[PDB]
Amino acid sequence: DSRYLPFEGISVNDSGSLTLSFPDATDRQKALLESLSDIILHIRYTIR
Amino acid sequence: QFFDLTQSFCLMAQEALRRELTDNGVTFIRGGAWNGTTAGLMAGETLLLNLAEMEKVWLERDERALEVTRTVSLAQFYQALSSDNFNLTEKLTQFLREGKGNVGASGNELKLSNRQIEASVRLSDLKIFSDYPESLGNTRQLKQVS
Amino acid sequence: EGKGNVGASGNELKLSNRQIEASVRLSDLKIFSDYPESLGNTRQLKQVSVTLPALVGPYEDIRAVLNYGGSIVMPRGCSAIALSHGVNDSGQFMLDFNDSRYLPFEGISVNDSGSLTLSFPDATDRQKALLESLSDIILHIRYTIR
Amino acid sequence: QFFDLTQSFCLMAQEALRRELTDNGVTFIRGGAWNGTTAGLMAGETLL
């Protein structure tokens, strides 16, 4: 892509944190989240 | 008016090059392109030289990067933390049955704020630099996350 | 036993530091003999992929680096790839044979006296289970004849 | 300054051709494009 991808440029040693948020988890997504097994992140990085 | 816009484009073009080389110290638009001794003329020619210098350093210091994939299981990550650990499935189901919850240290945390659940993972705590030897390069940055 | 060395220089399997390394000399593959001496004298690599038929658990990634050690002048960053899944792995997020930039290992003569080296970091250590399960190493080398 | 950058681009363009033909002996940028008799003019035309 001619435009920057999301999260591109973030140093892999960054002291900041990624946050995954599920709205209405009480509420409309209780059934889904109770069935959730875990959370998987597929992070791809480059080495120079 | 056109010089103001044109130099603005040059500056945001310089910022793109700084991001690609990860070197904030490089400077090519040095000011003084518009000089009173020439009534503002030769401003574009000066900026053309600056852009040409930008391209030359870009071509000379460009590098094909090693492209790595890292898979992270949040259940594994939260359980293996040294100091402030917890269990992802048990705490998640607990937070849903009683609509309150908070567990973990700041940065590596699972909480139910408002009516929204939130899982926090600190990037430096994944220790991705340790996955490969300290050689092979010092610039390791994210490209895409799924 | 976390020590080891076997083979001549260039065609060698060793465990240096806590890292295992497999060396294969390019000229010893006798790739010129695969086709008659006619049809062209210029035979150079174009792209190299690696397959690792092992039993790796889900959400676990292979960590290996294929490296070129010869003396032929290379473009910046085109002397190594990083394997992370091992199934026809090219080390690239999206391989393209029409790329405007040189592919890794491209331009190396198929008669080169240098050697390719596959390295597994943390083989003592976090990847002991994977390497004990490894069946062998397969190189998918693509080259051109002129 | 522009001639310095332009001739540098020509050289790395020549090196790309040498890699593609696998012939290091071919030479096209022979020097003297900038000549003192014309105060440096006609340099771009020579490189073309």
A48 and C77 within 8 Å at the Cβ level: the answer is yes
B108 and A27 within 8 Å at the Cβ level: the answer is no
**Short-list C102, C84, C80, C105, CA closest to C93:** C84
Using alpha carbons only, how large is chain D's radius of gyration in Å? 12
Rounded Cα–Cα distance for residues B113 and B96 (Å): 12
Q: Which residue has the tokens 């690792």?
A: C52
Residue B11 — φ and ψ, nearest 5°? -65, -45
Q: Is the distance from CB of A17 to CB of B120 less than 8 angstroms? A: yes
The CA–CA distances, whole Å, from C136 to B26, C22, C50, C129, C132 equal 47, 11, 11, 14, 10
The CA–CA distances, whole Å, from B141 to A13, A15, B56, D30 equal 8, 13, 24, 42
Q: Two tokens at C146?
A: 């002129």
Q: What is the dihedral of CA D37, D41, D46, D48, to 10 degrees?
A: 180
Q: Two tokens at C89?
A: 């792995």
How was it solved?
X-ray
Burial of A5-42, coded b for 16+ CB within 10 Å and e otherwise, reads: eebbebbbeeeebbeeebeebbeebbeebeebeebebe
Which strand (E) or helix (H) includes residue B102? Answer: strand B102-105
Q: Which residue has the tokens 């597929």?
A: A42
Let me know the angle formed at the C-alpha of A28 by A25 and A34, rounded to the nearest 5 degrees: 55
Residues in chain D: 48
Torsion sign, CA atoms C30, C31, C35, C39: negative
Rounded Cα–Cα distance for residues A9 and B144 (Å): 10
Nearest neighbour of B66 by CB, restricted to C75, C80, C102: C80
D5 and B52 within 8 Å at the Cβ level: the answer is yes
Q: Two tokens at C18?
A: 């806590």
The residue among D19, D20, D21, D24 with the most chain C CBs within 10 A of its CB, best to mutate, is D19
Q: What is the dihedral of CA C24, C29, C31, C34, to 10 degrees?
A: -150
Nearest neighbour of A45 by CB, restricted to B19, B88, B128: B128
Burial of C82-97, coded b for 16+ CB within 10 Å and e otherwise, reads: bbbebeebbbbeeeee
How many C-beta atoms surround the C-beta of residue C66 within 10 A? 23
**CB within 8 A of B76, min separation 6: which ones?**
A38, C59
Rounded Cα–Cα distance for residues C53 and C133 (Å): 9
What's the gap in Å between the CA of D20 and the closest CA on chain C? 8
Structure's resolution in angstroms: 3.1
Q: Is the distance from CB of A33 to CB of B96 less than 8 angstroms? A: yes
C93 and A40 within 8 Å at the Cβ level: the answer is no
